[PDB]
Amino acid sequence: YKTPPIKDFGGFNFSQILPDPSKPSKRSFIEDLLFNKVTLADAGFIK
Amino acid sequence: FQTRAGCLIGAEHVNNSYECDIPIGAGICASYQTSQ
Numbered sequence: 001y002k003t004p005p006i007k008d009f010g011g012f013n014f015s016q017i018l019p020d021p022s023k024p025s026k027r028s029f030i031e032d033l034l035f036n037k038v039t040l041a042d043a044g045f046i047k
Numbered sequence: 048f049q050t051r052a053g054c055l056i057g058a059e060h061v062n063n064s065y066e067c068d069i070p071i072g073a074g075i076c077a078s079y080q081t082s083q
C-alpha cells in the first residue's frame with residue numbers, strides 16, 4: 001500500500017514515521033535514528 | 048552475474064521481478080522459466 005500524496009489526516013501527523021524520499025534508502029526519521037543507534041558488527045558484505 | 052551474496056554463474060539476469068522461487072540472498076531469487 002502507498003500513502004496518498006496529500007496528508008490530510010484530520011490534524012494527526014505521521015511525517016516522522018512515514019518514508020522520507022530524500023534518503024537513498026527510503027526509511028523514516030525514526031527508522032534512521034534506530035539504525036544509527038545500533039553499532040552493528042559483521043554486516044556480511046561482499047568484502 | 049555479480050550479487051551481494053557472491054558470483055552467480057549459469058543463471059541469466061533479468062530486470063523483471065517475480066515472487067521468490069529459490070532464495071539466493073541479498074534480495075536475489077532464482078527460478079526456472081522461459082526454450083527454458
Ligand SMILES: *[C@@H]1O[C@H](CO)[C@@H](O)[C@H](O)[C@H]1NC(C)=O
Nearest residue numbers: 048049059060061062063064
Ligand atoms: C534491464 O533493466 C533496465 C530496465 O529498465 C534497463 O536497463 C534495461 O531494460 C535492461 N538492462 C539490462 C542490462 O538488462
